[PDB]
Design a protein around this ligand. Sequence first.
Ligand SMILES: *[C@H](O)[C@H](C[C@@H]1CCNC1=O)NC(=O)[C@H](CC(C)C)NC(=O)OCc1cccc(Cl)c1
Ligand SMILES: *[C@H](O)[C@H](C[C@@H]1CCNC1=O)NC(=O)[C@H](CC(C)C)NC(=O)OCc1cccc(Cl)c1
Ligand SMILES: [Mg+2]
Ligand SMILES: [Mg+2]
Lengths: 301, 301
Amino acid sequence: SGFRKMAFPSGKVEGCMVQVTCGTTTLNGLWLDDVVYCPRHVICTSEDMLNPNYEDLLIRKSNHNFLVQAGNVQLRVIGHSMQNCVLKLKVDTANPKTPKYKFVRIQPGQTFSVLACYNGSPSGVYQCAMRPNFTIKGSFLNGSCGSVGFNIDYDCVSFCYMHHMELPTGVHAGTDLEGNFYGPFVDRQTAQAAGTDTTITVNVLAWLYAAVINGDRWFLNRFTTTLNDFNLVAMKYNYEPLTQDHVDILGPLSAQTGIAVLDMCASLKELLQNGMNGRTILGSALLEDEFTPFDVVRQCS
Amino acid sequence: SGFRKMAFPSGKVEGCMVQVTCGTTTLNGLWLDDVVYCPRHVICTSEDMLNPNYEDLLIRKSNHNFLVQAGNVQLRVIGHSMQNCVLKLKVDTANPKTPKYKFVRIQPGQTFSVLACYNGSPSGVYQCAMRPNFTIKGSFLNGSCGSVGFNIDYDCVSFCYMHHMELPTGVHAGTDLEGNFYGPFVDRQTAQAAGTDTTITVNVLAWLYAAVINGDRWFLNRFTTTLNDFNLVAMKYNYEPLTQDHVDILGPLSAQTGIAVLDMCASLKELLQNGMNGRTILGSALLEDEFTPFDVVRQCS
Ligand SMILES: *[C@H](O)[C@H](C[C@@H]1CCNC1=O)NC(=O)[C@H](CC(C)C)NC(=O)OCc1cccc(Cl)c1
Ligand SMILES: *[C@H](O)[C@H](C[C@@H]1CCNC1=O)NC(=O)[C@H](CC(C)C)NC(=O)OCc1cccc(Cl)c1
Ligand SMILES: [Mg+2]
Ligand SMILES: [Mg+2]
């Protein structure tokens, strides 16, 4: 037993991280087969970062402008192109460590593991949720751009995030692996703010089921609510509406614990209205919303 | 910026995990050079688990009693021995993926990454602290034994934990890689309880420094206390005494923030006496004690 925020094992992605240097800017790239993927702002300078015209900047580059280091071995760049906000560098060597993989664009509320890297060298692994406002609450310093987020599904790595920037509130923004930002953000050093966020209701309910499976039961009650009455409470406390799709997704956890979804909603309602009164749930004094139903099932059996 | 509970990248350890099966019992083993390390209770049966005599059980085994699977490839066992609570199985094939490594026995309060595995197959990675009562708060199901805990120090893996069992409070117990339990525990299915735990004071202070580095300052105050006055507060709230060694270890964080250690102690004293009053620190409504000073420095720069 026990319930912990858990990342996927990172080895399959570690074997794909390289260093990309263009001028005085160095960040990370993702080496899959004979292509390296990295944020296109590697081709900016200090003065371009206000509002760069990236098509102009790339027309002015040649293959020799791009230094790609895979460990100690230098990879020779034989081609370059731009797709949305990602640069694709064709190299003469196919990565022998390329896992089975796919590129996925995730929905808000879904989680993924981040392999934080600097200078092409992985430094740590942690779990993130895509917030409803399309930011993530990560841990990224200068040089971390090009670090990727992923899930693993039977030795197939699904890449879903590449890191590009930090917002003024300290949260983080980036793209799918085709270079499309999550959210309304753009890759220039300007005044961009995260919109107001909301709490991921279906994940909170999943985490309450994790708590029951692990023996935390003090928040349960005999009452059951209706979906409409519950959603009126959710809106008052800045929680996302609960849909019937979410109810169905919580099916297996409801059946394993014998607690109907709308029964667990009545517990959540009372936790929101009355708080915890000095008690904790799975070691937390706040309601946690960064565990999906899949995350709970994967860990709780 | 940002501060997250972060594990070490797990690839170097993933390449070392194998499956060990003895009879109807299967757990995980650690394959380094031509030796596999695993918990010795793999040689028990259902009825032995009450109070087994392990030297008798091992004298009755032969090499062919041990099935060792490295992925699909079966490793042939050419020798077996017992060291404290670990079994060592000599195999005919040296692991080509053996990292640079060492075995370390850690002190309470230190942290490490756990690579949870089932059937020799890694499933997740997360961070743990060795509690003062020599348990860890992990996430382990049946079949997880032999999963290891480790730190990485410039591509050298220091192994410090091998998992053996779960206690009745839901916390976890195991050994160093030489087979010596952390704490007073023994590897049989009996009535063992974790002793009363305490909070790791030096880690809480490190985490308050992480919070300041990341812009959380609301808990600071002008006051400074003495080490003796602070330790009187620590004892009242079941915190470990703060030593001058801990003060020195917090030196670099004190210098980076300009906040003297005894100044931060006065903030901790007020947080303990008055609580948070609905505010949070680094996203937490409780004081966190599973980040070492090294963990904070590694992430905060
Ligand atoms: C790429 O490595 C970097 C990641 C940032 C650096 C600090 N935390 C991060 O996540 N991204 C940028 O520097 C980005 C480049 C623009 C052109 C998209 N700009 C940016 O994040 O500016 C905000 C910022 C906040 C704090 C510190 C810095 Cl250096 C930058
Ligand atoms: C080894 O895989 C297993 C790990 C346990 C299983 C449940 N969580 C864990 O961490 N260890 C044992 O089963 C151990 C064997 C003895 C001989 C040391 N006994 C044990 O943990 O018993 C306690 C227990 C609690 C909950 C569930 C189970 Cl199956 C066992
Ligand atoms: Mg109820
Ligand atoms: Mg002070």
